[PDB]
Design a protein around this ligand. Structure first.
Ligand SMILES: [Zn+2]
Lengths: 124, 62, 51, 96, 245, 217, 81
């Protein structure tokens, strides 16, 4: 669409002097960016259904292959040994510190975006 | 214990196909996104001084 | 016309209201890096918004 | 009841608010929360090993046993180092 | 009766007026790929031009570049078609790439065709709408062709001159063959002397003449020495040939 | 034909940015003799063109090996790297990539007792880089197999929930070894890609073109 | 107001060329050019003459949770060489 600043300039120039100060909250609301409101909550997507159906299919196929193996009970308790460390990772990992440490790996999120200053772009 | 596969070439080709897909997905899907997000910040950080000085010179408002 | 002019600039960026009009020329310098830092960080900090 | 949304909220309140370290009062017996996580890890491993052995206990072990035997089997298919012997003895045991 | 029936059917179903009738739908694609196959006929390219002439204003940058390269390869100038091409480039100058604009400007240079608005929009697109290292990936012959285009039209843009001057190098001139490098160096030095613009990178052009002065004539060596003296005065120093070290 | 939308500042984007910038920093560019300006910019771009994509290749191998290594630590799953041909094919492919790059630098055909010795120790990189990954992924897994076999042998014979201290000690040792397997998985992917950088970067040296003519002072 | 709801609108999505990776791994697993891991190609006369139980061999049918290690689901052909 057309840009919002030209809409500000046009609709501010179109107001009368008496109409100006109360129209300013409307004009601002017509120049505010679209932030889409929360739409319909569907169930799971067809790719999410495909993902979890294929994951459960893979887990059942792998458990059936593990049970038919020679040291089958050894494999079935290896699954317990690995799920135990998954459960302990859920408990031990400081996920907020991990998130903010990953934010420091990228330079785009390690710093605030420093660019255009206000004093150079002042219009009058 | 399993040591030797049924086919060495099939398993090496599986490794090649997986690593070639990871290479394509890195070069094509991940690196353009990463470079857009990185280089916007990097170009603004590298150009803040010269950009603000040039815009300060071009501005007749003062 | 003056009210419309300042209405446009304060609709795009209301942080200009934290620098008073008489003090503004006292901030400037010949080069941009020499502009007084009395209002710089406060202006850029107000420009992010209410959060 | 959406099938996954209620499951997500129930798993969230189980994951965060439910804590057996506080509701069973385990700060008296244990020094830390991390010591509870380690003890709960090894306890989960032990509970899993015991229920996987209890789900099927009369079977002949594929893993090598340390010269031992389960309960009163002693010389049955369960305590046979020879696996062909154990299979044929399992058939006679199954006959009953 | 296979021979006469097959021969009669092939000429009727296979001759160059019906494969102009397959090429009415996508004229840029077909004209480009038929001209690259060596099929350059004025008889077919007039029908190409009038088939594509209403479609030009909605064409993408790839299709405009393909059409423009094809009509250079045919050497068929249509004034109305290339006016439409130039209006398309002027309307969408931010979307065009330097890789495409060099090929378009080479065709607009091959026959003489220019506008002030077209030259301004091509210069704005190469200088500001494209990457500043895009002349580095260009090849020095295309940059020399664009330079003599702006020199023959008399249109002078110092920012475009700096941008296109950045593409001239020991690498880019080393990629050229010696007979091609002679024409590229001479035309680039003539354009730089016409504008009076002497950047640092002119050391790569003048040096490319003075490393191999045996291929140049005495007249061309005189004009190269004149450009060298002018660039020595403009850059405030003396031109040295640098050996391996 | 429609690409998806991405949020800026996402955790996978940030992690992958840090990983790529780590593997790119392994073989940095040489600082030229001249001050880098518009005169030296095409020589810098040409020098980047001569350099191999060791950042992209090391990031590819790091991601594809840390994924296959952490697959072995997920329940019901095995590591693809624990297979011989997979890990050794990755290693022989890295060695062949470095060899093909070095052959492209020297002219596409292959170069007293010193020449056989150094050629044997160079050709052993092909074996070594893949086999040091494969037997390491076989390592904690086969030790884990035998140890959980004895960890099953204790309550199968002493009773299901009786003699809990002995099985407690064996399950503590098992838990410590699966944690060591996690460390070895992440660390073997890292060691592989560090080695891929130092093997490919041996042939990553081309000469700077530079200016053949200057205007001094 | 934020872009959070806009990103909550988009569901789960696979990586962009995951179908090519799956169709490469599956095509490597099914275009082996050799029989399927304990089978043998036989003549059509043998295959139609042989019943379904004699074609099956007990090593390729191990028992799901075997009470003795080595239990097989089928007994194969009663005819022995
Ligand atoms: Zn295993």
């Amino acid at each position: 669409e057309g840009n919002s600043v030209a809409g500000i300039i046009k609709s501010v120039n179109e107001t009368s002097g008496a109409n100006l100060l109360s129209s300013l909250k409307t004009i601002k609301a017509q120049a505010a960016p679209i932030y889409p409101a929360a739409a319909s909550s569907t169930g799971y997507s067809t790719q999410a259904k495909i993902a979890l159906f294929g994951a459960l299919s893979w887990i059942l196929y792998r458990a059936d292959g593990q049970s038919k193996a020679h040291e089958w009970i050894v494999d079935l308790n290896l699954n317990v040994l690995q799920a135990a460390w998954l459960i302990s990772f859920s408990s031990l990992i400081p996920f907020r510190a991990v998130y903010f440490a990953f934010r420091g790996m990228a330079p785009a999120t390690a710093s605030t975006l420093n660019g255009l200053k206000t004093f150079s772009s002042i219009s009058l | 214990m399993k040591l030797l596969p049924e086919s060495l070439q099939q398993e090496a080709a599986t490794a090649a196909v997986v690593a070639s897909w990871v290479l394509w997905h890195l070069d094509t899907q991940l690196l353009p996104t990463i470079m857009r997000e990185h280089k916007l910040h990097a170009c603004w950080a590298a150009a803040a001084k010269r950009y603000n000085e040039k815009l300060f010179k071009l501005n007749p408002s003062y | 016309r003056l009210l419309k002019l300042w209405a446009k600039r304060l609709l795009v960026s209301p942080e200009l209201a934290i620098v008073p009009l008489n003090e503004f020329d006292a901030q400037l310098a010949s080069k941009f890096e020499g502009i007084s830092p009395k209002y710089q960080e406060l202006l850029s900090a107000v420009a992010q918004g209410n959060k | 009841m959406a099938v996954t949304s209620f499951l997500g909220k129930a798993f969230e309140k189980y994951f965060y608010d439910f804590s057996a370290y506080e509701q069973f009062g385990l700060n008296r017996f244990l020094s830390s929360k991390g010591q509870y996580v380690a003890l709960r890890h090894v306890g989960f491993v032990m509970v899993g090993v015991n229920v996987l052995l209890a789900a099927n206990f009369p079977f002949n072990p594929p893993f090598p046993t340390i010269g031992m035997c389960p309960a009163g089997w002693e010389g049955t298919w369960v305590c046979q180092a020879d696996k062909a012997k154990a299979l044929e003895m399992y058939k006679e045991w199954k006959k009953s | 009766p296979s021979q006469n029936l097959v021969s009669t059917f092939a000429n009727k179903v296979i001759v160059e007026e019906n494969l102009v009738n397959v090429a009415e739908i996508d004229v840029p694609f077909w004209s480009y790929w038929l001209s690259s196959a060596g099929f350059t006929s004025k008889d077919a390219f007039v029908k190409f031009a009038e088939a594509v002439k209403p479609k030009v204003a909605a064409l993408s940058t790839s299709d405009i570049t393909n059409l423009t390269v094809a009509f250079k390869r045919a050497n068929y100038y249509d004034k109305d078609l290339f006016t439409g091409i130039e209006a398309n480039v002027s309307a969408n100058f931010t979307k065009f790439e330097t890789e495409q604009l060099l090929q378009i400007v080479a065709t607009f240079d091959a026959f003489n065709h220019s506008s002030v608005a077209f030259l301004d929009d091509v210069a704005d697109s190469i200088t500001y709408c494209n990457h500043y290292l895009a002349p580095v990936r260009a090849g020095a012959d295309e940059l020399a062709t664009l330079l003599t285009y702006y020199a023959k039209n008399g249109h002078e843009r110092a920012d475009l001159l700096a941008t296109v001057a950045r593409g001239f190098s020991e690498v880019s001139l080393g990629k050229l063959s010696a007979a091609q490098r002679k024409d590229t160096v001479l035309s680039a030095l003539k354009a730089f002397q016409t504008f009076g613009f002497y950047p640092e990178s002119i050391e790569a052009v003048i040096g490319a003449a003075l490393v191999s002065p045996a291929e140049y004539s005495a007249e061309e060596l005189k004009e190269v020495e004149a450009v060298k003296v002018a660039a020595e005065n403009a850059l405030g120093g003396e031109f040295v040939l640098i050996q391996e070290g | 034909s429609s690409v998806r939308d991405v949020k800026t500042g996402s955790l996978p984007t940030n992690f992958l940015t840090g990983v790529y910038r780590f593997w790119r920093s392994q073989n940095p560019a040489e600082k030229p003799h001249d001050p880098v300006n518009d005169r030296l910019l095409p020589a810098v771009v040409d020098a980047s063109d001569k350099r191999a994509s060791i950042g992209t290749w090391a990031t590819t191998f790091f991601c594809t090996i840390i994924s296959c290594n952490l697959l072995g630590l997920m329940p019901f799953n095995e590591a693809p790297t624990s297979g011989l041909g997979f890990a050794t094919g990755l290693g022989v492919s890295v060695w062949a990539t470095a060899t093909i790059l070095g052959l492209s630098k020297t002219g596409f055909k292959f170069p007293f007792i010193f020449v056989p010795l150094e050629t044997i120790s160079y050709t052993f990189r092909a074996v070594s880089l893949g086999v040091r990954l494969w037997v390491n992924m076989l390592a904690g897994h086969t030790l884990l197999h035998i140890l959980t076999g004895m960890a099953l042998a204790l309550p199968f014979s002493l009773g299901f929930f009786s003699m809990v201290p002995a099985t407690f000690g064996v399950c503590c040792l098992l838990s410590a070894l699966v944690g060591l397997e996690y460390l070895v998985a992440v660390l073997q992917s890292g060691v592989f890609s560090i080695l891929s950088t130092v093997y490919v970067g041996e042939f990553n040296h081309d000469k700077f073109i530079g200016p053949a003519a200057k205007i001094v002072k | 107001m934020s872009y959070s709801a806009y990103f909550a609108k988009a569901g789960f999505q696979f990586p962009a060329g995951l179908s090519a990776l799956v169709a490469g791994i599956v095509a490597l697993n099914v275009c082996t050019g050799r029989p399927t891991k304990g089978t043998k190609e036989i003549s059509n006369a043998e295959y139609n003459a042989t019943p379904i139980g004699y074609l099956q061999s007990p090593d390729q049918h191990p028992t799901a949770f075997p009470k003795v290690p080595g239990m097989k689901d089928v007994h194969g052909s009663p005819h022995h060489h």
